[PDB]
Structure formats: structure tokens, C-alpha cells
From Swiss-Prot:
Expressed in erythrocytes (at protein level). Expressed in heart, liver and skeletal muscle. The gene is VDAC1. Keywords: Acetylation, Apoptosis, ATP-binding, Cell membrane, Host-virus interaction, Ion transport, Isopeptide bond, Lipid transport, Lipid-binding, Membrane, Mitochondrion, Mitochondrion outer membrane, NAD, Nucleotide-binding, Phosphoprotein, Porin, Transmembrane, Transmembrane beta strand, Transport, Ubl conjugation. The keyword ATP-binding applies. NAD(+) binds at L242, I243, G244, S260, A261, L262, L263, D264. Inhibited by nitric oxide. It is found in: Mitochondrion outer membrane; Cell membrane; Membrane raft. This is Non-selective voltage-gated ion channel VDAC1.
Length: 285
């Protein structure tokens, strides 16, 4: 109702299609369920059939009061276990406090991190600080919002030293029927994305990145085509003459099936084709 998502509108649609599902021939699974009772069940994990590579994770979240109290816990059965709590200032509207803590199984290593930021209807900025044992690091992320213009800046300051450890920048541009999302990884990595939707049922997306220092440029094109039902067919391609295809269609009333396939014409004929399966969605009534 107040202070809409600006950081998420930096390039979610672009990165969503740009991040080609890693087709390792395995099966992914993800189900999220939230209710107005403070109880939130979040399950995320993957399983490899071709090879013995299956790992599942369980995350417990809580949702109390619309925009009041939120808790996020991430515990892995095989991986590391950790939890986090988020509280929204009642009197100090806009003040958001999130405290997370990581813990290793049968290790004793405990990591504490505190995140404090403020969200304004005009702009949303937040500062996070991760406390480590070998060297604590700070992660700051500030997003600016403008009528039609969007901006986002996120970088981490190197506590162990007197300088920044990592710098990330991203620009968001919203237009009538045009959407442009740019993003650069530090002063050494710079890239951009351009999404154009056609009048008809044809969506177009573009994403490319360039590594400063060398003349190596990488670009990719991905489009989406809706058939009619709950099944949509998407296509993608890499500058390396790579043929990509992703089919997203819902199966059951709560879970969606996502298919991905990558064919590298570089040796796809004298080699093989890549396939990736993964189901993601939310469990509701
Ligand atoms: N159209 C395409 O994208 C195609 C891709 N491919 C293959 O995909 C492979 C690359 O897969 P990736 O490693 O995933 O490229 P990738 O590693 O660049 O995917 C991650 C990218 O997401 C960006 N990003 C933006 N916001 C993010 C966020 N909030 N969280 C995480 N990441 C965020 C990161 O800057 C990063 O560049 C290429 O080798 C190419 O052969 C294949 C065919 C076409």
C-alpha cells in the first residue's frame, strides 16, 4: 500500500530470463506457503538423477500482521543451519531491522550479522553488517526511486581494511511499453539489459555484459510466447551461437513445472544436448 518495491524493479524481469536455468540434467523443487497466522512454510531443494547429487533445504518463515513482524529461518539438513528475524518499527514507520545468525553443524563456528535500514515511499535504502571470525564485512544497499526513473546502488565495504571489498551498481528504467534494466559488477564488470514487449503476444528481452580490460563481450537474446493455457513457451540464444529453450507450464494447483534445454551448436551435433528440470511455485487453497 505504501512504498512500493523499487529495488526489485531494478532488473528482476531481465535477470529472471537472463539467468538461464543451469541444465545439469537434475530435478529442482521449490514450494512456498504463507498464511495470515504467523506460520510460513518454505521448502527448497534439488535432486540429481543422472548422478548422486541431491540436497534438500528447509526454511521456516513467519508472517504476523500485514507489514509488521516477519521472521525468516534457513536450515539445511546437510548444509549449514541458520535463522533470521525481521521487525518493522511501529512508532518509527519506515525503520526496518533484520538480524540473521548462521551456524555450522558439528563445528561450533557461529556467525552473527545485523541488518538495519529504512524504507521511504520516495526511496528505499538499507545498511547491513556481517560479523565474521576471520574478518567481518559490511554490505550496503541503497535504492533510489524517481517518477519513471529508477536507480539502485549496492556495495560491500571491507571492514578488515579501510576500503570497499566489492562494488555493485544497477539502473532501472520504466517506460510505457518499454523496459530497460542495466547492471554492472564493480568497476571491472559492466553490462546492461533491454526488454521490449510487442503489441501482440510476443515478448523480447536482451542481456549482455562486458569485462573491462579485455575485448570480450557476451550478449544474449530471450523471448517469451504465451499459447493460451497455463503453459508458456520461451526461447533464448547466446552470442556463442547457443540455442536455448525454456518451457514454463503449471501442473498441479500449487506447483509449476519449468523445463530448460541448452544446445551449444559449437559441438551439440557431435556432442549432446543439455536438459534441466525444476518445479517452483506456492502451495495454496
Ligand atoms: N540468453 C541467455 O542468457 C543464454 C544463456 N546461456 C548460457 O548461460 C550461461 C550463463 O549462466 P549464468 O552463470 O547464470 O550467467 P550469470 O552468472 O551472469 O547469471 C548471474 C547474473 O545475474 C545477475 N544478477 C542481477 N541481479 C541479481 C541478483 N539479485 N542476484 C543474483 N544475480 C543477479 C548477476 O550480475 C550475474 O551477472 C552462459 O555461459 C551461456 O552460455 C545459454 C543460452 C542463452
Amino acid at each position: 500500500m505504501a512504498v512500493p518495491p523499487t529495488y526489485a524493479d531494478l532488473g528482476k524481469s531481465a535477470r529472471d530470463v537472463f539467468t538461464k536455468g543451469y541444465g545439469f540434467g537434475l530435478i529442482k523443487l521449490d514450494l512456498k506457503t504463507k498464511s495470515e497466522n504467523g506460520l510460513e512454510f518454505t521448502s527448497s531443494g534439488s535432486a540429481n538423477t543422472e548422478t548422486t547429487k541431491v540436497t534438500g533445504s528447509l526454511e521456516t518463515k513467519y508472517r504476523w500482521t500485514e507489514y509488521g513482524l516477519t521472521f525468516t529461518e534457513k536450515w539445511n539438513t546437510d548444509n549449514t543451519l541458520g535463522t533470521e528475524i525481521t521487525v518493522e518499527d511501529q512508532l518509527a514507520r519506515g525503520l526496518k531491522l533484520t538480524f540473521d545468525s548462521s551456524f555450522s553443524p558439528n563445528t561450533g563456528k557461529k556467525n552473527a550479522k545485523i541488518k538495519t535500514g529504512y524504507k521511504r515511499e520516495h526511496i528505499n535504502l538499507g545498511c547491513d553488517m556481517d560479523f565474521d571470525i576471520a574478518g567481518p564485512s559490511i554490505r550496503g544497499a541503497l535504492v533510489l526511486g524517481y517518477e519513471g526513473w529508477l536507480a539502485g546502488y549496492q556495495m560491500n565495504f571491507e571492514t578488515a581494511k579501510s576500503r570497499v571489498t566489492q562494488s555493485n551498481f544497477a539502473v532501472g528504467y520504466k517506460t510505457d511499453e518499454f523496459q530497460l534494466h542495466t547492471n554492472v559488477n564493480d568497476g571491472t564488470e559492466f553490462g546492461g539489459s533491454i526488454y521490449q514487449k510487442v503489441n501482440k503476444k510476443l515478448e523480447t528481452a536482451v542481456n549482455l555484459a562486458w569485462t573491462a580490460g579485455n575485448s570480450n563481450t557476451r550478449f544474449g537474446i530471450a523471448a517469451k510466447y504465451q499459447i493460451d493455457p497455463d503453459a508458456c513457451f520461451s526461447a533464448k540464444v547466446n552470442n556463442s551461437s547457443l540455442i536455448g529453450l525454456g518451457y514454463t507450464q503449471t501442473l498441479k494447483p500449487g506447483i509449476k513445472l519449468t523445463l530448460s534445454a541448452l544446445l551449444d551448436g559449437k559441438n551439440v551435433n557431435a556432442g549432446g544436448h543439455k536438459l534441466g528440470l525444476g518445479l517452483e511455485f506456492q502451495a495454496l487453497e
